[PDB]
Design a protein around this ligand. Structure first.
Ligand code: FES
Ligand code: K
Ligand code: MG
Ligand code: MG
Ligand code: MG
Ligand code: MG
Ligand code: ZN
Lengths: 38, 161, 99, 40, 177, 43, 75, 38, 43, 162, 100
């Protein structure tokens, strides 16, 4: 997880999900793509 | 069985307040005459005890009754013991009925009389001004003329028609 | 100096007291203070707040009558506003004209 | 209260203005004689 | 009234006992009602120096309901006075610790900020459930209407009410609802 | 079963005694709200 | 703007003053238009005469009536 | 004082703030939403 | 916390003032009077 | 509506679907010109989170929302009902539309806190530890902004932030 | 059946206008409490050889306990019960004016 003001999907396997009141980018193929809304 | 403007019942379909239906003006006009006649007969037959009145006098309103005292804050140009009529009566009330002017009751309906019993002056009223650091200080004393009135009688006549 | 300036506050505080007392009496009859005062004016009843507060304490039956009158005039206002002018003026809504 | 409403009826916004409530004589002699006119 | 002077004075200035049911009611609306009564502002004879406040009994304070997310967001702050003594707790945490604290604090903050306030609080009787001591129960005069109308759950509607509400749409017959 | 009078008190005994006085005042015509004495000049 | 208010006799607020509806007067009124309320004087019973000079009243509608009886309308 | 042109958005005089508030665009609102009609 | 630097209503950084509903209505009420003044000054 | 039954007989599984009774829209809607169920019955701007009789018609047996293509609602109304149902669940007004629990799952007891007009999910909201100055106060949202256009019978508009 | 206010608590209000329309008449007789709505007043509250004598049960309490008792009895704070000094006691007017 890296904090990001602007969330961007970095590959086709990235999916946007809103959890605990904020948006997240999750990626199983490339876990490094994981991002947290700041 | 649904009209063009029908709305199913919801929390906001209709206003919160209940619907009020006022009486038919024709039917109510007859009811009003009955009430006025009933109260008028109470006056003719003297079915009232002590009366009170709201009178406008010297710019302000006074709720009064027989034997009351009121302190007028100015001179009236009347000798002590002189009897006068208070001509501006907004309200006259009894135990079981009340009459309201719009805004003043007719002079035929009610007569309020009063007597001047004292003409004097108020206790000294200090007027002082002060502003810090400006050598600004002044004092004045004023005594205001006053008149004491006794309400002698409140009388009503059966002139409600 | 305090005695001099207090004459302004005395008048202000007295009227606040009357409004509080009138508000209390009005709520006993299910009326808010602005509804009573506003609608009494529309009936050409010019009783001031000092007298109205006195009536609430010492003439409770007269005050209920005044509260009823204001409530009646208030409902007449609603009926008129809802209508499109077809309805004649309310019985208590008629104003006595002077000249 | 009611200033705008009074204006709509052709009355003074303040009830202390023109009209019978203010201008009419406050009192008269008990016998009937009218009082001297008020200074205001 | 034709009463004697002393009984007349006693009646006019008597203390009334009011009952309020806090179940499903927001504490603020309860507090606004209790504050008026505790001060005496509901009496035409009201005056600040007339000590004319009444008794208010509030039951079911454990069952108050906040609107929105106030249970999680509303914080109650205090300080023991010692270094590190600043304490902040959510409404939910306070409620489970003290089932009368929320209503008590809401009322306390609404009363005038003067030396009469703590006297008025002595006339407030908060109970978390429906148990009221017999002595307090015996002196009650009138129950005040609940400020919030409690909405009915779907299981509480009578079949007449359900039938009266029309069906608004026709679902497809081949849909796995 | 008709209310002739009603009186307040700090106790039931005191309230009952006051109610009796109220009833007596009504019976004798000395009610607080009775017609005031007429001091007007005799006609 | 202070000086024109004085020239027009408007020093005291809420005190109606009558002025001629002419260009020169209007020129002053325009400078202080944001400080005043302008309404037309209406004469429903005509101008006051010497007989009724003392019985006039300026109503809130802007009508200057030449009779002021302080009585209700019999109509 | 500050100059007429600033890097930050200069605070307005309160009377001007009120002027702006009172002169905001009000869009034409239809009696019936156009999506609710054929 | 929440201090305004320097004096509240002057300088570069100020306490923000917001326009209430009744402040708007007050201004509009006087705009209507002036608009009518324009009319009666046109003839 | 259509159900599905799974039956294992003789070490064999049979999957079948049956058509059950389907409810029909009430006849003679007051506004036949309406383009969705809401405006066909003149219900636009006239329902709230506690109108479960209305809300319950657009949800699944376990409390989930129904697709907009099936109900026929417009995007605007569909979103309003969606929020209204969430608030209805959180207020406890839909006790017979609880989530499906797998066999052997009894939820552990949790503190009961009565709430209504709850915009957010309780677990996702943080405490307001620093309220901020009066001119920048952190507010507690109440209700939903989607319902801002609901008919207002009072002179004060709905307060959505407390 | 229209009534501006409920008529069941204080008085029966009837509002009317005179034929001319210049006076409002308000008839407001009192409503008496019904007998059915009342309770009965609670009048209801050995071979002892020895005369029963009055026993004094008024044991003196210390200031603290005494003030706690008084504060609880009258639902007040303790502060009202504590004494005041001579300066204040002697300022109080012991012959105050009396209106009626
Ligand atoms: S189309 Fe009418 S509200 Fe949706
Ligand atoms: K500054
Ligand atoms: Mg004032
Ligand atoms: Mg400088
Ligand atoms: Mg500059
Ligand atoms: Mg500073
Ligand atoms: Zn990825």
């Amino acid at each position: 997880f890296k904090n990001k003001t602007v969330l961007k999907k970095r590959c086709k396997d990235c999916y946007l999900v809103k959890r605990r009141g904020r948006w997240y980018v999750y990626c199983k193929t490339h876990p490094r793509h994981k991002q947290r809304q700041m | 069985s649904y009209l063009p403007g029908y709305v199913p019942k919801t929390s906001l379909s209709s206003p919160p307040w209940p619907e009020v239906v006022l009486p038919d003006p024709v039917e109510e006009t007859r009811h009003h005459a009955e009430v006025v006649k009933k109260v008028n007969e109470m006056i003719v037959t003297g079915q009232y005890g002590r009366l009170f009145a709201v009178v406008h006098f010297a710019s302000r309103q006074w709720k009064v009754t027989s034997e009351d005292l009121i302190l007028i804050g100015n001179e009236l140009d009347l000798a002590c013991g002189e009897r006068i009529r208070l001509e501006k009566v907004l309200l006259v009330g009894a135990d079981n009925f009340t009459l309201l002017g719009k805004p003043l009751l007719g002079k035929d309906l009610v007569r309020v009389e009063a007597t001047v019993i004292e003409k004097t002056e108020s206790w000294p009223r200090i007027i002082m001004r002060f502003r810090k650091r400006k050598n600004f200080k002044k004092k004045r004393i004023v005594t205001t003329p006053q008149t004491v009135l006794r309400i002698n009688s409140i009388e009503i006549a059966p002139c409600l028609l | 100096v305090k005695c001099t300036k207090a004459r302004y506050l005395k008048k202000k505080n007295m009227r606040t007291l009357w409004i509080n007392r009138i508000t209390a009496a009005s709520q006993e009859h299910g009326l808010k203070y602005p509804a009573l005062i506003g609608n009494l004016v529309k009936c050409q009843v010019e009783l001031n707040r000092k007298v109205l507060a006195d009536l609430a304490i010492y003439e409770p039956k007269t005050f209920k009558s005044l509260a009823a009158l204001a409530s009646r005039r208030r409902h007449e206002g609603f009926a008129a506003a809802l209508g499109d002018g077809k309805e004649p003026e309310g019985i208590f809504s008629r104003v006595v004209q002077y000249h | 209260a009611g200033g705008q409403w009074r204006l709509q009826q052709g009355l003074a916004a303040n009830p202390s203005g023109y009209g019978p409530l203010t201008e009419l004589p406050d009192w008269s002699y008990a016998d009937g004689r009218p009082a001297p006119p008020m200074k205001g | 009234s034709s009463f004697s002077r002393a009984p007349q004075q006693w009646a006019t200035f008597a203390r009334i006992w009011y009952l309020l049911d806090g179940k499903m009611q927001p504490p603020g609306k309860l507090a606004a009602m209790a504050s008026i009564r505790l001060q005496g502002l509901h009496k035409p004879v009201y005056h600040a120096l007339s000590d004319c406040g009444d008794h208010v009994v509030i039951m079911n304070t454990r069952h108050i309901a906040f609107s929105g997310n106030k249970w999680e967001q509303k914080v109650y702050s205090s300080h023991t006075g010692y270094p590190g003594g600043f304490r902040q707790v959510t409404a939910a945490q306070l409620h489970l610790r003290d089932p009368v604290a929320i209503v008590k604090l809401a009322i306390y903050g609404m009363l005038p900020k003067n030396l009469h306030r703590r006297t008025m609080m002595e006339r407030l009787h908060l109970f978390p459930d429906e148990y009221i001591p017999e002595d307090i129960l015996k002196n009650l005069v009138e129950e005040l209407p609940q400020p919030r109308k409690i909405p009915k759950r779907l299981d509480e509607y009578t079949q007449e009410e359900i039938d009266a509400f029309p069906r608004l749409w026709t679902p497809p017959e081949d849909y796995r609802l | 079963k008709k209310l002739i009078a009603e009186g307040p008190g700090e106790t039931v005994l005191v309230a009952e005694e006051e109610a009796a006085r109220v009833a007596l005042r009504k019976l004798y015509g000395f009610t607080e709200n009775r017609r005031p004495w007429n001091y007007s000049k005799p006609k | 703007e202070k000086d024109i208010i004085k020239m027009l006799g408007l020093e005291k607020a809420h005190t109606p003053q009558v002025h001629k509806n002419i260009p020169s007067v209007n020129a002053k009124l325009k400078v202080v238009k944001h400080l005043i309320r302008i309404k037309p004087l209406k004469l429903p019973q005509g101008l006051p005469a010497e007989e009724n000079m003392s019985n006039t009243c300026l109503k809130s509608t802007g009508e200057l009536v030449v009779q002021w009886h302080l009585k209700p309308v019999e109509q | 004082g500050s100059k007429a042109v600033t890097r930050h958005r200069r605070v307005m005089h309160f009377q001007r703030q009120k002027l702006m508030a009172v002169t905001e665009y009000i869009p034409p609102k239809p009696a019936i939403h156009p999506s609710c009609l054929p | 916390r929440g201090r305004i630097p320097g004096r509240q209503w002057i300088g570069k950084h100020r306490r923000p003032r917001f326009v209430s509903l009744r402040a708007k209505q007050n201004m509009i009420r006087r705009l209507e009077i002036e608009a009518e003044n324009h009319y009666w000054l046109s003839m | 509506f259509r159900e599905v039954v799974e039956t294992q007989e003789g070490k064999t599984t049979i999957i079948e679907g049956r058509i059950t009774a389907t409810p029909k829209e009430s006849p003679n809607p007051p506004n036949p010109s309406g383009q969705c169920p809401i405006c066909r019955w003149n219900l636009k701007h006239k329902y709230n989170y506690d109108d479960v009789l209305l809300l319950s018609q657009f949800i699944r047996p376990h409390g989930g929302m129904l697709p907009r293509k099936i109900t026929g609602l417009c995007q605007e109304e569909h979103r309003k009902i969606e929020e209204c149902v969430k608030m209805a669940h959180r207020a406890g007004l839909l006790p017979n539309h609880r989530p499906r629990l797998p066999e052997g799952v009894v939820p552990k007891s949790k503190p009961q806190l009565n709430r209504y007009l709850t915009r957010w999910a309780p677990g996702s909201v943080k405490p307001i530890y620093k309220k901020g100055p009066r001119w920048n106060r952190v507010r507690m949202p109440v209700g939903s902004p989607l319902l801002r256009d609901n008919v207002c019978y009072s002179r004060t508009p709905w307060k959505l932030y407390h | 059946t229209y009534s501006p206010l409920p008529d069941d608590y204080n008085c029966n209000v009837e509002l009317a206008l005179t034929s001319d329309g210049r006076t409002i008449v308000c008839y407001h007789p009192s409503v008496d409490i019904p007998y059915e709505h009342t309770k009965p007043i609670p009048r209801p509250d050995h071979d002892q050889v020895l005369k029963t004598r009055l026993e004094e049960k008024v044991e003196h309490l210390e200031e603290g306990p005494m003030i706690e008792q008084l504060s609880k009895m009258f639902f007040t704070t303790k502060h009202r019960w504590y004494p005041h000094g001579r300066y204040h006691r002697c300022r109080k007017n012991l012959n105050p004016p009396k209106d009626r």
